């Protein structure tokens, strides 16, 4: 709305989790730069009083900062004039059973802001709008039902007078849908499902008119056998992007359920799809399915980055996205034309490549999954070569700095029944480091890309997966947190590490920045968790537990322990 736009245009503020409508997660603040970053030090810190994974980052509106924790999803408001005082807080009372239906740790990716309100959700499915000044509840509505395995973890997204919110739960057969509510009343405007009839999915009359080969009408049911689509996943729990001019919002729908591919023949549309929908009606103008008939749990909900760059000497409105499947996609955000589809790392073997003409991946049978067979050395693993991390883009050098994962796996499915409220996975995995690390043990990379060609400029290897993402600031710095507990800053030109600080626990969110009283500050949450930390968080030892993650991250507990809080830095 107008209030959000005002904050967006206020220097030093941070009202949107991804950094803006285009989600480039960057900042023009340049007080801290290559020449003085070595003098950066901790300014102050704040503990949430909660453990488990602390994803996302705080919001800064004027003189106020809003911090959020992991389940039970507490909200704290601090006046930057005195970080030692909690002005108001909201501590939800939720049933502990909610945690049992959350697949990948009890995380929360953040708050949103609009019309003088803090838009906040709770794991148990409630969505609330709180007065930003007092914390008073203006409205509260139900969005997901934990009894059927549906929960909330992603950050809400505000555009104009609409709030976008999607439920999580594909691992429990939840049928995905992006729900739109009225920012002022919390009233349900519309709902666009990921599977089912064209009406339920909400396709405009000219859906994919520019690329009819992507598929158009009736596929929401035709690419499934029987009523399998009723529990076919497609949940969107990642991030959004929005283009004010076109009035289109973008996001990706998740993986189909169950993981057992043999139990659901068909392309399984429209799961694993990059969408371009009209904000007011929710009608899709175009949709590109990245991974037809998923066989590896490559949930396609990753960040959408909108940029305007020259394509063949011609300025073009683009959308770039690095999916779990290891492919970097760059499309025209107006019509959905596919421009780039390159492997982020040569280790990707599930596809020989993505044919730009057919618009589909050329599958390699050797690395497929199927009943009564154990697939081995499959890259990427289900954790993907990129997950929930939020990356940054530098407008000047036109470079995206991505936090990647270098993990592969062994995978074998098994038959199981569907029971509402119970997990519906059906697969046994084993995960381990990819093959290209310097010592073949590294599982993370910070890699700079050109979004128009899909080629890398430089690479920095990390012992553990770069789960949280990166932040880019005009001073020429790339900031990011590691699972082992460090906040680091790199020279954006060559990836040279210029500064670092050992926080109390690993970070799984992306850093943010803001200014207060003329001083630039860098903020990062800390407190390891999420899928990578399930072993540590729940004391699991079975290497196959945590859906295969436990074995891969067995060493994490020798570098960090749980935590929950925020650390701020400055000159």
């Amino acid at each position: 709305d107008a209030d959000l736009d005002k904050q967006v245009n206020t220097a030093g503020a941070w009202p949107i989790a991804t950094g803006g409508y285009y989600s480039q997660h960057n900042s023009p603040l340049a007080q801290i730069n290559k020449s003085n970053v070595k003098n950066v030090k901790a300014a102050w810190s704040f503990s949430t009083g909660v453990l488990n994974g602390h994803e996302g980052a705080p919001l800064v509106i004027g003189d106020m900062m809003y911090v959020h924790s992991a389940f039970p999803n507490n909200t704290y408001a601090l006046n930057l004039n005195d970080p030692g005082k909690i002005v108001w807080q909201h501590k939800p009372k939720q049933d502990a059973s909610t945690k049992a239906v959350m697949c990948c740790d009890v995380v929360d990716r953040g708050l949103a802001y609009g019309a003088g309100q803090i838009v906040k959700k709770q794991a148990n499915g409630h969505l609330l709008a709180l007065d930003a000044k007092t914390g008073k509840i203006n409205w509260e509505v139900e969005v997901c039902d934990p009894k059927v395995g549906s929960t909330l973890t992603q950050a809400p997204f505000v555009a104009k007078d609409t709030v976008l919110m999607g439920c999580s739960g594909a691992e429990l057969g939840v049928r995905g849908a992006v729900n739109a509510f009225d920012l002022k009343t919390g009233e349900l405007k519309w709902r666009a499902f990921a599977t089912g009839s064209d009406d339920s999915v909400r396709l405009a009359k000219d859906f994919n008119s520019a690329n009819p080969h992507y598929g158009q009408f009736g596929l929401g049911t035709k690419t499934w056998e029987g009523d399998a689509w009723k529990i076919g996943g497609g949940t969107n729990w990642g991030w959004y992007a929005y283009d004010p001019k076109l009035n289109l919002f973008y996001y990706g729908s998740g993986n189909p359920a169950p993981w057992n591919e043999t139990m659901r023949p068909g392309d399984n549309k429209w799961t694993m799809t990059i969408w371009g929908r009209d904000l007011d009606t929710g009608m899709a103008k175009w949709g590109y399915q990245k991974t037809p008939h998923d066989e590896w749990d490559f949930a396609g909900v990753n960040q959408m980055v909108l940029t305007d760059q020259p394509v063949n000497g011609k300025m073009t409105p683009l959308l770039s996205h690095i999916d779990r499947n290891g492919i970097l996609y760059t499309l025209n955000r107006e019509n959905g034309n596919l421009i780039v589809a390159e492997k982020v790392d040569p280790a990707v073997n599930v596809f020989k490549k993505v044919d730009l003409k057919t618009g589909t991946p050329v599958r390699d049978p050797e690395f497929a999954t199927r009943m009564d067979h154990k697939g081995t050395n499959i890259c990427p693993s289900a954790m993907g070569f990129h997950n929930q991390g939020v990356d940054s883009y530098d407008p000047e050098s036109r470079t995206l700095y991505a936090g990647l994962n270098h993990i592969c796996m062994d995978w074998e499915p098994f038959m199981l029944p569907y029971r509402a409220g119970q997990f519906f996975v059906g697969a046994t995995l084993a995960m381990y480091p990819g093959p290209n690390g310097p010592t073949k043990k590294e599982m993370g990379q910070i890699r700079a890309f050109d979004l128009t060609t899909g080629k890398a400029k430089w690479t920095k290897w990390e012992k553990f997966a770069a789960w949280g993402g990166t932040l880019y600031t005009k001073g020429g710095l790339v900031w990011y947190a590691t699972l082992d507990g460090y906040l680091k800053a790199l020279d954006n030109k060559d990836g040279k590490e210029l500064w670092n600080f050992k926080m109390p626990s690993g970070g799984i969110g992306s850093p943010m920045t803001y200014s207060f009283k003329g001083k630039q500050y860098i903020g990062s949450m800390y407190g390891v968790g999420g899928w990578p930390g399930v072993g540590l968080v729940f004391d699991l030892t079975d290497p196959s537990a945590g859906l295969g993650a436990v074995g891969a991250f067995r060493e994490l507990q020798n570098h960090t322990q749980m935590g929950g809080g925020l650390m701020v830095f400055s000159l």
Binding site: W139, E140, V141, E142, D145, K147, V148, S150, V174, R175, T185, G186, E187, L188, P212, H213, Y214, G215, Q216, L219, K222, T223, E225, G226, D227, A228, K230, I231, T262, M263, P265, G266, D267, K269, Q289, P292, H293, D355, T358, T360, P361, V362, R363, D364, P365, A368, R370, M371, M415, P417, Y418, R419, A420
Partner: protein, 57 residues
């Protein structure tokens, strides 16, 4: 099954060698209980009803 053989635009799925074209009646038949399959729809209906009475007040 390389994903390049489409029956119609947007539908290129193919059964892998040795696997059925249709799983119903095969050993891979999920035999989903129609009652369970409709629980999400029922849950949403009841939920939307509750939200409506909130906005009403």
């Amino acid at each position: 099954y390389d994903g390049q053989n489409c029956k119609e635009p947007g539908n290129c799925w193919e059964n892998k060698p040795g696997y059925p074209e249709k799983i119903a009646g095969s050993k891979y038949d999920p035999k989903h209980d129609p009652v369970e399959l409709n629980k999400q729809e029922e849950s949403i209906k009841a939920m939307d009803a509750r939200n409506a009475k909130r906005i009403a007040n």
